[PDB]
């Protein structure tokens, strides 16, 4: 399981 979340502000 690959879980990936990224926020760019």
Question: Cα(1)–Cα(3) distance, rounded to whole angstroms?
Answer: 6
Question: Cα(4)–Cα(7) distance, rounded to whole angstroms?
Answer: 11
Question: Cα(2)–Cα(5) distance, rounded to whole angstroms?
Answer: 10
Q: Solving technique for this entry? A: electron diffraction
Question: Cα(3)–Cα(9) distance, rounded to whole angstroms?
Answer: 20
Question: Cα(9)–Cα(6) distance, rounded to whole angstroms?
Answer: 10
Question: Cα(7)–Cα(9) distance, rounded to whole angstroms?
Answer: 6
Question: Cα(4)–Cα(2) distance, rounded to whole angstroms?
Answer: 6
What secondary structure does DSSP assign to the chain, as a single string? ---------
Burial 1-9 (b: 16+ CB within 10 A, else e): eeeeeeeee
């Amino acid at each position: 399981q690959f879980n990936n979340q990224n926020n760019f502000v």
